[PDB]
Design a protein around this ligand. Sequence first.
Ligand SMILES: O=P(O)(O)OC[C@H]1O[C@H](OP(=O)(O)OP(=O)(O)O)[C@H](O)[C@@H]1O
Ligand SMILES: O=P(O)(O)OC[C@H]1O[C@H](OP(=O)(O)OP(=O)(O)O)[C@H](O)[C@@H]1O
Ligand SMILES: Oc1ncnc2cn[nH]c12
Ligand SMILES: Oc1ncnc2cn[nH]c12
Ligand SMILES: [Mg+2]
Ligand SMILES: [Mg+2]
Ligand SMILES: [Mg+2]
Ligand SMILES: [Mg+2]
Lengths: 193, 187
Amino acid sequence: YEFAEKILFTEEEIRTRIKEVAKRIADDYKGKGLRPYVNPLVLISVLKGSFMFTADLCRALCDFNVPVRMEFICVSSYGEGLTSSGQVRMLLDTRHSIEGHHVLIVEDIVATALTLNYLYHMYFTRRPASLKTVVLLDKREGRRVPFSADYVVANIPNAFVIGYGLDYDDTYRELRDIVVLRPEVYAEREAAR
Amino acid sequence: YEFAEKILFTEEEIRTRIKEVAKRIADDYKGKGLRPYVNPLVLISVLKGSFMFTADLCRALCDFNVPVRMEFICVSSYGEGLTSSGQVRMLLDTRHSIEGHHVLIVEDIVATALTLNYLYHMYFTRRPASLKTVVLLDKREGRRVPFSADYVVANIPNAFVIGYGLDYDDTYRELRDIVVLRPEVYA
Ligand SMILES: O=P(O)(O)OC[C@H]1O[C@H](OP(=O)(O)OP(=O)(O)O)[C@H](O)[C@@H]1O
Ligand SMILES: O=P(O)(O)OC[C@H]1O[C@H](OP(=O)(O)OP(=O)(O)O)[C@H](O)[C@@H]1O
Ligand SMILES: Oc1ncnc2cn[nH]c12
Ligand SMILES: Oc1ncnc2cn[nH]c12
Ligand SMILES: [Mg+2]
Ligand SMILES: [Mg+2]
Ligand SMILES: [Mg+2]
Ligand SMILES: [Mg+2]
């Protein structure tokens, strides 16, 4: 990728880490007696970014016999830009109630944590049986508000990453690898506005 | 797979076919001058079933250097027997306007085609540079309204399939393979 400063994780690496995280989620939830139809683990996939991670994660979870039920929601905060708007917009909420069910919010990245903080708070008041979060990437040095996900596949430095569902101006979501976007590429693009 | 009466496609067979379809889409768009930001191929992923197909397809398209823009839409039924035009309530629509853009609607399965036909014409009215559809599975014999998808990964018999995004009672979407649900189970 000529627009990439560097590749952080290859597709193979992500796949490996996701399987390991799935095995852990499976072990941690064993006592919950998850069962299809009556007791699935509800995966709240945060669109658009989480589509890819969710697709691969639910499969890895299936490998470990963890039955799941997908709920796709859509939340917006960065829009076409590089930084948090400071506002988290709910564009689509869950189709069904989460009350009394085990819920795992599936996110591609946590940076300032405004998104996950807003989401966790919203669902928390809905009284699910349990509420946890799994993030693909944790940009630890990017927090504006505190938040610690229950499961983290990878930690990354303070650089704008793209690929594997993550975008910059709704571009690059389709990359198989996670890469650092060159500032000369986003600067030119940002300049175009 | 005790709940399945037969295996239709394994994850590896699906993976392969998707790549062949992506290579074709790429060739068919080679003369569209597609470029990121300004002229990407807009994939309108119809939730919830196509989320998995969309994830692997966009990656296959990326293998062929096609710049894509992902859109996810959520539709709902107005009520029972309130239409036959396949009209659906739009709970979540495209973020960007498709007007003047090359669009590809992504679906997991087409059978009756009532909803997909409705969606096709709806987006068609928004005036995109072009509009095509790609469906992973097609029950050609199930049509309730005439409809032909532009790209299809596999034609299948009239049996209820699950897995690879497809569900039954919101169950089994996470399967890596596409299997036929034991008719008894479906009831
Ligand atoms: O921790 P935060 O600073 O809140 O940043 C993380 C959020 O920002 C991104 O979403 P975005 O708002 O870009 O929407 P998107 O998923 O559709 O790309 C990313 O997908 C997370 O949802
Ligand atoms: O062509 P037809 O026989 O009418 O059916 C096709 C539609 O039904 C299914 O969606 P569903 O209503 O099941 O929504 P879902 O994708 O969220 O499961 C499938 O995923 C297509 O959207
Ligand atoms: O590095 C990054 N890439 C894509 N989206 C986001 C959001 N926060 N931080 C990001
Ligand atoms: O076989 C099938 N499996 C899952 N959803 C649908 C819709 N129509 N036909 C289906
Ligand atoms: Mg997001
Ligand atoms: Mg974004
Ligand atoms: Mg569907
Ligand atoms: Mg369904």
